[model samples]
Target: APTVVHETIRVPAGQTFDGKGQTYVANPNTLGDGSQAENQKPIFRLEAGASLKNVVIGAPAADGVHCYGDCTITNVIWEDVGEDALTLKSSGTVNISGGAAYKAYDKVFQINAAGTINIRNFRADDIGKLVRQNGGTTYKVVMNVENCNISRVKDAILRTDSSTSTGRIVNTRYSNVPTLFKGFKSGNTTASGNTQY
Candidate 1:
C-alpha cells in the first residue's frame, strides 16, 4: 500500500503538495536504508512557505522530511522512522497538526536552527524523544505542543541543549514517558494540564 519512490520529491517554495493519502516509501537508491546516518537525504524536501498534507511516510525514511523555512504539515503519518522523522533545517515557523508518528528510535522532530514549531493534535508511539533541538546548536528554539497523545517513549518528550530554548506543552495525554524534558534551563519550559498514566 506504499508508493515506492526512487528519488527525493522537491517541494517548490510557497506551494502545497497533497499526497492524497498515499504512503511514500523510498527506494534503496534513495533514503530507503533506514539508517541512523546523518548524511542521508530526505524523501521530501520542502522549501519555505510550503505545505504538506495527507501523506504517509513509509519505512526506511531516509533522513525524513526537511523544511528549509516556514512550512505547514497536516494529517501526515510516519510508519517507520530513519535518522529522524522531520527536521527544521532552517530558521522560520513550522506548524504541524493532526499527525502521527511511530517507531522513531531516536526522535520524531529535530530543529537545527532557531525558530518556532507549533504542534497540535498529534500522536506518537515507541519513540526516544518526541522533539529535540539539534545537539549541534545552542540557540533559541520555541516549541508548543498541545492536545496530543503519546506513549512508550524511552527518553524525554522534549530535549534541548540550548538554555535559550523554550517549550510549552498543554493538554497532553501520555504514558511511560520517563521525563517531560531534559537539558532545559529552569523556567525555560512549561507544561500544564498534561495527564500522565
Candidate 2:
C-alpha cells in the first residue's frame, strides 16, 4: 500500500480513484500550524460525484475525508486520525459501506445540515464521538447507520434540536461507551437491535 504524507488528494468532480489498497498518512505538523481552520485540512477531498474505494487513511491531521457532493466510498479504512474520519459538508449525498474507523480525536462521522449520509456494514473503534449532528439549519439532515460495530467510544451518537434532523442506528453493536446516545436533546433519532455495554 502506498502511503501519502503531508499532502492532500483532491478528487475532481465525477472522478474515481481505486486505491487498490493504498494508505494515506498526514503529517501532524501540517495541521493548524497557524494557517487555516484547525479542522479544515484533510488527507482527501472528494468533489461532486466522486468515488473512492479500497483505501486506508491513517493519522490524518484533520478530518480524513471531506465530502463535498454526491460521493460513494466502499471498503475504506480510517485509522489513527486526529479529527473526524469522514465529513459531509455540502448539499449532496454520501454513501459509505464496508469500512472501519479507529482512534479518531473527534467524531467518526460528522453529518452537516446539507446532505444525507447512508452508512452500512461499517465499524468504529476508539472514537471520541461516533456520529454528531449539527442541527440548527432549515435543511433537514438524515443519516442511517445499519449493521455496524462500534466500540471504545466516548459518545456513540449525539444530535441536537430534533426538528431539523433525523437518524437511526439499526442492528449495530456498541461497547465501552459512556453514553450510547446523547442530545436526545430534541430530535427524531432512533436505535434498534443494538447491543450496548
Candidate 3:
C-alpha cells in the first residue's frame, strides 16, 4: 500500500528531486477520471530541463507526467497509468530511463511536438501503445527504445500516423504484443536485436 495525495507536483527547471519512495496518487475528486480529457493536470509537471527521480505514481495518476521540454525522468514508476504515462509536450530531447509503467489506458509516452525521445531499461505491461505521435503530424519525431521489456500491449508497440516520424528499438523484448512499429517509412524506423515471444 502507498500514501495518496490530491495535488499536482511541479519540478523546477534544471533541478532534481528524490521522492524517497512516496507514491503520488492524484485524487479523483480534483483530477479527472484518468481519461482522455484535455488539459488533465499531470501528477508531476516538469519544467524545461527538469528531472524527476525515485518517484512512484499510483492510480488516478491524472495526466501522469508532463515534460515541458528537454527533461530527464529517472527511476520513476507508474504503478497504474492514467491518460498517458508521460507526455513530451514540447520539442527537444527527452530522456526516460530506468522505470516501468503498467495499466496504461492509451499510451505510455505521447509526443505531441517534434522531439527526440529516448527510453532505456524500462518495462511496460497491459498498455495500448508504447509510443505515439500527434495524429497526422508531419514533424520528424523520433522515439528510440532500448533494453526494454514490453508485454500485453494491445496495439502496436510503437505507432505514429506521421510518415516522417521514426521508431527504433534495440536489445528489447516484447511478448503478446502486436506490430513493433506501425505507420512509418522504410527508412524511418529501425528494429535491431529485438525479439518477440
Candidate 4:
C-alpha cells in the first residue's frame, strides 16, 4: 500500500513545503528569478513515489512545477503560466488525463522522464506545443499522446533535444501545429510532421 496526502497550500516565492491536494496561488512575484532573478524560487519539489491529486495551481502569469523523481497529478489547472504550463523533470512516469487544460503556454506538457510519459485529452488552446524535450544524452525520455486535442499551438506540437528522443502516437489527434522533434540519442535532430506555417 502507498500513502496519499490531501492539502491546499498557497505558495509564493521562497516558500518551501509539501503540497498535497493543495490549492496554490501562483503570482508573478512568486515566479521570482526562475527566468531572470538571481534568487529564484524554482518550484515545489515532489519526491519519488509521491502523488498529488485534485491540486489547483492558479496564476495570473506563468508558474513552474518542479519534480525530483516520479510523481502523478490530477485535476490541475494552469491559468496564465507561460512556457509549458507544466514541466516535469528527472526520470519517471507522468500522466495527465480527464479534462486537464494547459493553455497559454509554450508547451502544454513537458518531461525529462527517461521512462514513459502518457498524456491524454490534453486540450491546449493558444499554447505552444503538447510536449517538449526528450531522449537526451545520459538519459532519454519517451512520450505518448492518446486522444489529445492540440489547438492553436504556434510552434511544433512536440519539440525535443533533437533526434534520439522517441515519441509514439499510439492513437492520438491534433490540429494547427507542425513538426515533432525526435531522435535524442544520436544527437538533437527531428522529423517533420503535419504542420502549417
Which one is best on lDDT? Answer: 1
Question: Model 3, stretches more than 4 Å misplaced?
Answer: 1-3
Give the alpha carbon lDDT tens digit for every residue of 41-98 in model 1. 8888999999899999988677778999998999999998877888999999889999
Candidate 2 residue lDDT tens string, 1-197: 65745667889999988888887777666642212245657777899999999988765446678888888999998866566777788888889889898877667777774678888898888877777765455466677888988788875554544465677889988888786665543446788898886
Write model 4 residue lDDT over 1-197, tens digit each, in one string: 11221221233333334445454553445554223233233334555545445555544323345555665655565544444455566777776664455555455666765655677655556776667763344456676666666666677766566444567654445666655443345434323342333
Best by TM-score: 1
Clash totals for all models, in order? 0, 2, 0, 22
Report, for every candidate in turn, its global Cα lDDT versus the true structure.
0.89, 0.74, 0.87, 0.53
Question: In terms of TM-score, how similar is model 4 to the real structure?
Answer: 0.67
lDDT of 2: 0.74
lDDT per residue for candidate 3 within 1-197, as digits (tens), equals: 46565677788889887787777888777765577787777888888999999899988888888888988989999998889889998888889899899999789898988998999999999999999887788888989999999999898888888878889999998999878998998888888898887
TM-score of each: 0.96, 0.85, 0.95, 0.67
**Model 1 error, position 153 (Å):** 0.9
The deviation in Å at residue 104 for candidate 2 is 1.1
Q: Which 10-residue span in candidate 1 carries the lowest summed lDDT?
A: 30-39
Q: What is the lDDT of candidate 3?
A: 0.87
Error of 1 at 133 (Å): 0.7
Clash pairs detected, candidate 3: none
Clashing pairs for model 1 are: none
The better candidate by TM-score, 1 or 4, is 1
